Amino acid sequence: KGEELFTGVVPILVELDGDVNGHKFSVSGEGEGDATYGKLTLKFICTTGKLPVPWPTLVTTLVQCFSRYPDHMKQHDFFKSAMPEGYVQERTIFFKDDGNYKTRAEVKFEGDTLVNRIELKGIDFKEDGNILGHKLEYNYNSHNVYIMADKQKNGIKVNFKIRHNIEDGSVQLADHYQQNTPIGDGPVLLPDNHYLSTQSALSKDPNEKRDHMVLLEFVTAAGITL
Amino acid sequence: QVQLVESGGGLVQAGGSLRLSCAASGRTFSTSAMGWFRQAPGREREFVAAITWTVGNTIYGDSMKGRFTISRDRTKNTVDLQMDSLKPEDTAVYYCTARSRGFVLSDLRSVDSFDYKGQGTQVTVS
Numbered sequence: 001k002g003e004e005l006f007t008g009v010v011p012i013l014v015e016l017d018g019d020v021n022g023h024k025f026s027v028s029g030e031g032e033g034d035a036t037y038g039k040l041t042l043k044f045i046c047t048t049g050k051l052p053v054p055w056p057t058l059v060t061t062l063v064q065c066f067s068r069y070p071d072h073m074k075q076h077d078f079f080k081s082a083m084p085e086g087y088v089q090e091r092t093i094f095f096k097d098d099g100n101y102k103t104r105a106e107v108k109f110e111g112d113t114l115v116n117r118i119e120l121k122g123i124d125f126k127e128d129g130n131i132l133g134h135k136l137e138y139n140y141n142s143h144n145v146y147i148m149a150d151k152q153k154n155g156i157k158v159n160f161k162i163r164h165n166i167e168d169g170s171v172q173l174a175d176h177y178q179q180n181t182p183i184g185d186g187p188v189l190l191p192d193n194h195y196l197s198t199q200s201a202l203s204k205d206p207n208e209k210r211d212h213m214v215l216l217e218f219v220t221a222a223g224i225t226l
Numbered sequence: 227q228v229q230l231v232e233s234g235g236g237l238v239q240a241g242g243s244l245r246l247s248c249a250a251s252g253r254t255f256s257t258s259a260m261g262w263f264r265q266a267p268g269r270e271r272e273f274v275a276a277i278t279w280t281v282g283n284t285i286y287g288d289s290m291k292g293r294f295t296i297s298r299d300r301t302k303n304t305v306d307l308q309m310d311s312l313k314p315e316d317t318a319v320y321y322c323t324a325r326s327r328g329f330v331l332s333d334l335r336s337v338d339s340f341d342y343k344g345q346g347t348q349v350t351v352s
Contacts, residue, residue: 005330013280086258086328108328110258110278115328117280119255183256184327 002083006035011113014062020122023052038068040217045210054136055213056164059200061103063116067196067219072226076191078156084109085184094175099125130172137165138202145196155181194223228252230322230344237350238312246307248322248344256326260298260305263337264318276334312351319346
C-alpha cells in the first residue's frame with residue numbers, strides 16, 4: 001500500500017536542528033527521490049552560518065524508503081510499508097576515540113512531499129580531534145547497511161560502521177546503532193535479514209556562497225539471492 | 227502527548243469577523259498538520275480547515291473557502307483561524323486539532339483524522 005506512493009519521482013524536504021558541544025546550528029535540505037532506481041538527489045544548507053562539524057559526519061542522519069527493493073524482495077521493505085503515516089528513526093553514532101551523536105527523527109509524507117525532520121545532540125568531542133578540528137576529507141565511501149526485524153518493538157534494528165577518510169591518509173570510524181518503529185498502527189512488513197548497498201557522492205555548487213553540501217545516493221537491497 | 231488551548235470566541239453580528247487562536251504544547255516536534263472543526267448542538271462534526279505543518283498548504287470545508295483563512299506560526303507553535311463574513315449558520319463550538327501521523331492530503335478532509343483535539347471555544351453569530 002505505502003509502496004504505491006513511491007512509483008515515480010517524489011520531492012523531499014529535510015530539516016535538522018543540532019547542538020554539538022554547545023555549538024547550535026540548523027540545516028535545511030531539498031531535492032528528489034526515485035525508488036525505482038534507488039536514487040536520491042539533494043542540496044543542504046547551513047542556515048545559521050558556518051557548520052561546526054564536517055558535512056560528511058551528517059550524511060547518514062540527513063530516508064531509506066527510497067532504496068530499490070527488487071521484485072523478489074518486496075515483502076522485506078519495512079520503510080515503504082510504514083507510509084504515509086511514517087516511522088521514527090533513532091541512532092547513537094560513536095566516533096572512535098572521540099565524541100558521539102544522538103539523533104531522533106521522524107520520516108513521513110505531508111501530502112506529496114516526503115519529510116525528514118531531525119534533532120541532533122553531540123557530546124564529549126575533542127576540540128582538536130578530527131570532527132571539531134575539521135580534519136575529514138570531503139568525500140564518502142560505500143557501505144553495507146545490515147537490517148533485521150525487531151518483532152518485540154514491531155520495527156527493525158540496524159547497524160553498520162562508516163569509514164571517514166582523513167587528510168593524513170588514515171580513517172575515522174563511526175559506529176552506527178539504529179532503530180526504526182512505525183508512527184501509525186497499521187500493518188507493516190517485518191523483513192528477513194538483508195542489507196542495503198549504499199553509495200554516496202558529495203559535491204559543491206560553485207554558485208552557492210552559503211555553507212552547503214550537494215549529495216547523490218544510490219541504494220539497492222540485497223542478500224536473499226532470488 | 228500534545229495539549230491544545232483555543233481562544234478568541236465571542237458573539238458578533240452577521241457580516242462581521244472573528245479570529246480564533248490555539249496554543250500547542252508538549253511533543254510539537256512530531257506535528258505534521260493542524261486544523262479546525264466545528265460542532266453545532268444536535269448536529270454532527272463538520273470539517274473547517276487544515277494546514278500542513280512544514281510547508282503550510284491549506285484546505286477548507288466547502289462552505290468556508292473564501293471566508294476563512296488558517297495560518298500557523300512554527301516558532302510559537304500556534305495556529306489561527308481568521309473568520310470573515312460570518313453567518314448565523316457558523317454558530318458552533320470550534321475545536322483545534324493536531325496530527326502526528328503523516329498523510330496524503332485528502333486524508334485531512336476526514337473530520338476524525340486528527341491525533342489530538344483541544345477544549346473548544348464558542349462562536350455565536352446574530
